[PDB]
Design a protein that fits this description.
- By secondary structure, the protein is an alpha+beta fold.
- The protein contains 3 helices and 8 strands; from the N terminus they run ββββαβββαβα.
- It has one domain: OB fold (Dihydrolipoamide Acetyltransferase, E2P) (Beta Barrel).
- Helix content is 26%, strand content 31%.
- The structure holds thymidine-3',5'-diphosphate and calcium ion (CA).
- Calcium ion is lined by residues 15, 34-35.
- It is found in: Secreted.
Length: 129
């Protein structure tokens, strides 16, 4: 896998962000995760977490997997990195997301996230509380 540059356009919610990629605007959906809806418990906090992570970053990178790069809604599907830290993984580690939507061909970082989820659960963090 390889990291490509992008710049924040706008935070959206816990697992979507508007990014400029190769000069075009696009909504990215975070691979391998599911966060509560804004109206559901921990939904606001998930959004606030992702927002801070991406807004504070000096450098946002996008990392496509080996399979589908766009979903049925036209959203990009990627691992997003904020100053070299993976947002997908961070949310899961904080118990602000669950591992989810694991499809074959787009699951390189599955075991990594599951490990983070194992440790979030062990600590009864956020959704595991
Ligand atoms: C994460 C992810 C979601 N999706 C689709 C599945 C869901 O379809 P349905 O809307 O038909 O349920 C939807 C969930 O996204 P949200 O969790 O952002 O709503 O996004 C993909 O197709 N690929 C993926 O890698
Ligand atoms: Ca969601």
């Amino acid at each position: 896998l390889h990291k490509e540059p992008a710049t924040l356009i706008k935070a959206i919610d816990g697992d979507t962000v508007k990014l400029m990629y190769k000069g075009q605007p696009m909504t990215f959906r975070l691979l391998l995760v599911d966060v509560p809806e804004f109206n559901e418990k921990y939904g606001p906090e998930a959004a606030a977490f992702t927002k801070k992570m991406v807004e504070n970053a000096k450098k946002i990178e996008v990392e496509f997997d080996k399979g589908q790069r766009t979903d049925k809604y036209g959203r990009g599907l990627a691992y997003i990195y904020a100053d070299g830290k993976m947002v997908n993984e961070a949310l899961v580690r904080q118990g602000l997301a669950k591992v989810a939507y694991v499809y074959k061909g787009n699951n390189t970082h599955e075991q990594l996230l599951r490990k983070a989820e194992a440790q979030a659960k062990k600590e009864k963090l956020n959704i595991w509380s």
